[PDB]
Every structure is written in C-alpha cells, then in structure tokens.
Design a protein around this ligand. Sequence first.
Ligand code: HEC
Ligand code: HEC
Lengths: 131, 131
Amino acid sequence: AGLSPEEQIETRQAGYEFMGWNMGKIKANLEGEYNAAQVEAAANVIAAIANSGMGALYGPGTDKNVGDVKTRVKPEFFQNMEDVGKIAREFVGAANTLAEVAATGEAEAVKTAFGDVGAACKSCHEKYRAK
Amino acid sequence: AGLSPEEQIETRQAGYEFMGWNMGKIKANLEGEYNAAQVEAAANVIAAIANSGMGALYGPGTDKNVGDVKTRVKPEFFQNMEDVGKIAREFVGAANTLAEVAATGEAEAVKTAFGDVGAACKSCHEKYRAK
Ligand code: HEC
Ligand code: HEC
C-alpha cells in the first residue's frame, strides 16, 4: 500500500541530492555571471523541497540499511525528534527567505540568504548524518 | 554548475524520483481524503522541478552508462531534440497549471490537471525511457 523502507531511503536521498544541484547553481551564479531568473528558479526548488514534508520519509525501519540500500542517517535522528523538528523549521524559514530575496534579483541580498540556507543544511548534517 | 556525466545522470534521476513521490501523494489524496495543504505542497514541488532547467542535465557523454552509474534514457532522446522540446514545454505548462489549481483547494479541478501532468510524464517515458 505505501512506500517500503528502502524506497523511503532512496526518495529522501533524491530530494537532498536535487537540492544540492540547485545549491551549486546559486553558488556558480554568485561567483560568475549572475543570471537572476536562473537563481530564482533554483531558489524556488529549495523552498519547494523544504516545504514538501520529507519528515514522512523517515518512517519506522528506515534507520538501517535495508537490502541493497544504504542510509547515512544516525540513529539519534529518531529519539531526538523535537531537536530535528526545530532544525527543520529553521531550514524552511531560511529556504523561504532565499526564495523571497531571489525574487528581487539583487545578488548581494542573495549571498546572505544563501549563506543562511547553507548553515542550516550543515547543522543538521553535523548532528544527524553519519561519518 | 558544469557537471560531470555521472553527476548529470544521478541528478536527473533524483529530480524524477522526487517528482514521482510527490505525484503519488497527490493521487493518494484524490483517492482517500483530501488534505488541500498537502496537495499544494506536492504540486509546488512538481512545478519547481519542472521549471528547474533539467534540460541542462542531458549533456554530452550522458547517453550511456558512465562507470557504474546506469541510465535508462534511450539513444533516441538525443536524436529527437525537437520532439523532446515539444513534450518538455507541454510538461512544464501542465505542471504550472497543477500548482495554480492545487492552490485553490478544489479537488475536482485538481483531478483533471493532475491527469494532464500524468499524461505528459508517460508520453515522454513511452518514447524515451527504456521499458
Ligand atoms: C535535517 C533536518 C537535514 C536538513 C535540513 C538537510 N539535510 Fe542533507 N541529509 C540529512 C540526512 C539525515 C542525510 C542522510 C540521508 C540518508 O538517508 O542517507 C542527508 C543527506 C544529504 C545528501 C546526500 C544524499 C545522497 O545522495 O545519499 C545531500 C546531497 C544532502 N543531504 C544535501 C543537503 C542540502 C544541500 C541541504 C540544505 C539545502 C540539506 N541537505 C539539508 C539531513 C538533513
Ligand atoms: C521527458 C521529456 C520526460 C518527462 C516530461 C518526464 N520524464 Fe521521467 N524520465 C525521463 C527519462 C528519459 C528518464 C530516465 C533518466 C535516466 O537517466 O535514467 C526518466 C526517469 C524517471 C524515473 C526514474 C528515475 C530514477 O531514479 O532512476 C521516474 C520515477 C520518473 N522518470 C518519473 C517522472 C514523472 C512522475 C514525470 C512527470 C511528473 C516525469 N518523469 C516526466 C524523461 C521524462
């Protein structure tokens, strides 16, 4: 009926990976020729994936390697769900602000908001992603 | 950024897999009971990834397996770029309408727009993806 553990692991990893491509495209525009419409579209993807409810992909047996599929989540992610929830809400707030300032076309304002979204990816990885 | 072949195949598959999870959530809501806010967030992911410039992920060298990174794109894709462009434009128009209508909360209107984006996904798979 619903997604199996191994499918939930592949899907959250797809979501994270797609955000990474869009993060790299904003960094490449900030350093080379800034194209405001390309940054806006990339920022829009990060805000949409941050609001997508990825919490639903951390269901019961997804704390371990299942089949052919390997997870890098640390077991502490489960057991610290209020802390996870708070970092997650700091991340949708930073992701929503990037989308809003990307819409102004001003690269300097985008540099700052991008730095704050980066911070939020990093603080969750630091505590909850292995090795 | 200017990605390697490996990274282009891995990212395009990650975008598609994440759009499939969100399409599955809209069908679940249409068949079970509708949570309007859930459908809006899933619809906005589809339109943001449709608008993200994934055409950039079908560069040279990406038409075959690169190392042990496997791809399911048929060689035909790369021969028929005019047809791929036609399909891809109608896909982002349809994905744009799905996010526009899902924002109203009107389940019956979401039902036909969802069918249009679905049609656009299988039309490209029928011609250009192995199986
Ligand atoms: C927790 C609240 C997280 C936030 C916010 C972000 N990421 Fe993360 N990420 C997290 C975990 C627990 C994991 C491991 C998932 C697993 O099941 O293995 C990850 C993983 C990634 C990956 C690797 C995906 C893969 O190919 O296997 C990437 C590229 C990644 N994360 C990127 C990323 C970015 C760019 C973020 C902010 C925009 C971001 N993540 C936030 C946990 C969390
Ligand atoms: C062509 C113009 C396409 C449109 C529109 C959509 N898809 Fe597709 N998809 C396409 C190709 C050529 C491939 C293979 C890519 C590769 O390098 O292997 C795919 C693949 C998928 C996948 C599997 C990805 C994976 O992780 O291996 C899924 C789940 C998928 N496609 C879904 C999907 C959905 C739901 C679409 C519409 C909303 C959609 N695709 C559009 C080409 C095209």
